Write an enzyme that holds these catalytic residues in place. Structure first.
Site, PDB file in Angstrom:
ATOM      1  N   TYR B 161     -44.099  -4.549 -81.632  1.00  0.00           N
ATOM      2  CA  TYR B 161     -42.911  -4.855 -80.609  1.00  0.00           C
ATOM      3  C   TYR B 161     -42.775  -6.926 -80.066  1.00  0.00           C
ATOM      4  CZ  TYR B 161     -41.819  -0.176 -79.875  1.00  0.00           C
ATOM      5  OH  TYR B 161     -40.722   1.337 -79.936  1.00  0.00           O
ATOM      6  N   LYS B 228     -52.602   5.387 -83.845  1.00  0.00           N
ATOM      7  CA  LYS B 228     -53.175   6.063 -85.722  1.00  0.00           C
ATOM      8  C   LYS B 228     -54.317   5.601 -85.952  1.00  0.00           C
ATOM      9  CE  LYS B 228     -50.668   9.184 -88.513  1.00  0.00           C
ATOM     10  NZ  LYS B 228     -50.759  10.211 -88.099  1.00  0.00           N
ATOM     11  N   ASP B 282     -49.734  11.159 -83.015  1.00  0.00           N
ATOM     12  CA  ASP B 282     -48.603  12.498 -84.253  1.00  0.00           C
ATOM     13  C   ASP B 282     -49.445  13.449 -83.205  1.00  0.00           C
ATOM     14  OD1 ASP B 282     -50.206  12.820 -85.923  1.00  0.00           O
ATOM     15  OD2 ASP B 282     -49.331  13.204 -87.674  1.00  0.00           O
ATOM     16  N   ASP B 306     -44.758   3.651 -75.802  1.00  0.00           N
ATOM     17  CA  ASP B 306     -43.425   4.019 -75.331  1.00  0.00           C
ATOM     18  C   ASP B 306     -42.845   4.882 -75.699  1.00  0.00           C
ATOM     19  OD1 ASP B 306     -40.143   2.389 -77.014  1.00  0.00           O
ATOM     20  OD2 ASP B 306     -40.795   2.858 -75.396  1.00  0.00           O
TER      21      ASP B 306
END
Lengths: 420, 430
Positions: B161, B228, B282, B306
């Site tokens: 971002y 992750k 996830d 986010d």
């Protein structure tokens, strides 16, 4: 079962699936490669072959006959050929075009298969089979995620914060582009290409056309990452309009040409900001069917969708290239249930049904296999992973659940299974 | 009255400035708090929030505390009075006050997504994005909505971002591709756009420290790092490792690691200590859906943060009711997650709950006035339960006459004024 490329010997009683000009050619006695895999894999792959083969026979009356062809990967390959992944396996899948696969242990080998066969498209259907679920609208989740599986931040392009390689990158970016990155920062790279995006969207659209899907949704964070994810979205819209103009409609076109309604016979191609897309599958799951995404977005959304329908362990998947596919469960080798006769084979069975019914064209096989799994859940005859969530239900073993499923398949009336 | 220039800056009479010195926020009984009306529905929901908060503070502290509100300008009102969208004086005013409540701002001309908000965050170094997600009794798609009580601590400066990226067809992308190939043997296609993902030790540590401080303040029992790191070892993996590192370095006596608990400790969570654990990103999405009661404070880099906070708000039916704050070292600016809602602006229709709850976040959490948060949440819950709500909620409740914004404001004030403090503030005082 072959150990070298010259050993390559498919069963006699079966013809090969063909690729040679856009269309895939599937005969009535097709050779399908099957790999046993590791841990619960042999357990669940053998479970699937028995189930699918009671169907295919019960569905087509005997005119069709799947010919199962063994290829070796994992412990079975290392036990015979003396390696984890042999070349004869890859070439075996390459000639067959279609293969089913159990999970593999990584002391990943999954990525090697993908990279060697160019299995660029990861395909994950998410559907509700009546299990206990946390989503009030679990039954309106009927989705397939088309996830780009070669690029993005998952391509492994990255360097440790304290490496000399990271140091060279930092100085390169500073000097040439006035980009400042801290000295104590790890650095990853995110590539997204026109070629990879286009291929994936083409497959997604062809899938939608095959199954009469009416919405294809591009999931992207293109408002912040303009040149990777935004490019992804732009390139996906572009092939859609370029190669599928007559089958396709845009949200603006709907709200300009068609009085605010998507025309029957036409697919709505739309896009959702990635974090919004997560909210929308939760709030309005009936609004979404086919989801097209780059690697990470695809990983996240498919996982979230499976949780909604209480299907985490039941998630089936498939990796697809140009004329070629390999179906496999989402879950790993599960070394704690292997040789235990406890594990759920549902994922592996649905994977078989995905490959054979949803990619070879044998729609009737998917219809029944899913009828059975739904019937199994309805009368609370399933494995411990589901049975633990239902009050006072005795777990049915793995080998029991299979025979339970075959039973539902053969006992069924085909006028109530295959309609419309 | 509200200042356009640096010389005009004058906090209102009767107010005392919040201080921050030697790592401690000192909040007086009559604290100056800046507010920015903003754009679209901004003025409406900000006006509601000031009134509701004022009622809450009066009720709960018996007139011995009072917020002294200090109007600053950004967006359309700044353009009108000052001839520019974001006066330096506005930024300087927030820096002096240390605390500010703001409405949403329109993103100008062709400057980039939410660029005035970005400008404010960067000028004041508000590195931590804090989003509470709670259930207020709304109709909600999650069977376990009522078990969702979380706060997302999102690193808000780095990650993909940060805007480091080049178009596929650009000369720069071309030069990056060949540098990567010739120096590192990395292959990227010629038709690929290229983004860069930086994650640093410094940014991670700051964020984790604030998350742990929040956990200690709120008696949270679990802090979960969402990452992750199995795929992205040197960004997200490092994020996770650096977060665990500061936890053990600076909060040892207060925290226990999950890789410690089942091993050394009882197996089940020990008493007193905060469990610090981690979840693959996830899976973290799956976990908040399947077992929300297992999660409280979630710590995440920009993108993961986010996504997770959006997902959580959807679960509780709180999309248009979500609050947030962006926080730096001595300093915080609270604002709703939602935009300016141009279609609703000036219509007395909009739900002010998000703005009210942003103020409640600012005042009850950041400034420490716990009782204010307690009574505000109570009132919103009661309104929901009573079906006295604005149309966004009422439209999902068959036959209910929706309340105008101003009516809903008065309903919350009435609940606050009528509240039985022995019940509403049980275990919640001081």
């Amino acid at each position: 079962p072959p150990c070298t490329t010259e050993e390559l010997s498919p069963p006699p009683g079966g013809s090969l699936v063909e690729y040679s000009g856009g269309s895939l050619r599937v005969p009535d006695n097709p050779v399908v490669a099957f790999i046993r895999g590791d841990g619960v894999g042999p357990e669940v792959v053998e479970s699937a072959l028995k189930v699918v083969d009671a169907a295919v026979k019960k569905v087509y009356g005997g005119s069709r006959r799947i010919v199962w062809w063994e290829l070796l990967a994992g412990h079975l390959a290392r036990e015979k050929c003396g390696e984890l992944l042999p070349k004869a396996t890859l070439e075996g899948i390459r000639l067959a075009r279609v293969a089913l696969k159990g999970p593999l242990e990584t002391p990943s080998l999954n990525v090697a298969i993908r990279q060697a066969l160019d299995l660029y498209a990861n395909i994950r259907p998410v559907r509700y089979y009546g299990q206990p679920a946390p989503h009030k609208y679990a039954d309106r989740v009927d989705m397939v995620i088309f996830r780009e599986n070669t690029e993005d931040v998952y391509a492994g392009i990255e360097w440790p914060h304290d490496s000399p390689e990271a140091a060279r990158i930092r100085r390169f970016l500073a000097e040439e582009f006035g980009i400042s990155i801290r000295e104590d920062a790890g650095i990853g790279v995110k590539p997204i290409s026109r070629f990879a995006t286009r291929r994936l969207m083409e497959r997604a659209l062809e899938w939608a056309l095959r199954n009469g899907n009416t919405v294809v949704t591009i999931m992207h964070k293109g408002n912040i990452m303009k040149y990777t994810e935004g490019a992804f979205m732009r390139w996906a819209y572009e092939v859609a309009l370029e190669k599928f103009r007559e089958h396709v409609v845009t949200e603006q076109e709907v709200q300009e040409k068609y009085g605010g309604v998507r025309p029957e016979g036409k697919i709505l191609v739309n896009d959702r900001i990635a974090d919004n897309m997560l909210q929308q599958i939760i709030t309005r799951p009936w609004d979404y069917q086919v989801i097209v995404a780059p690697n990470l977005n695809g990983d996240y959304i498919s996982d979230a969708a499976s949780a909604l329908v209480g299907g985490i362990g039941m998630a089936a998947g498939m990796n697809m290239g140009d004329g070629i596919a390999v179906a496999e469960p989402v879950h790993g080798t599960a070394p704690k249930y292997a040789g235990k006769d406890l594990i759920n084979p549902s994922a592996e069975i649905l994977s078989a049904s995905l490959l054979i019914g949803e990619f070879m064209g044998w729609r009737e096989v998917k219809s029944i296999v899913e009828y059975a799994i739904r019937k199994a859940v309805q009368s609370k005859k399933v494995t411990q992973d589901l049975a633990r969530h239902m009050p006072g239900v005795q777990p049915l073993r793995t080998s029991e659940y299979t025979e339970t499923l075959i039973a539902y398949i053969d006992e069924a009336d085909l006028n109530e299974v295959l309609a419309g």
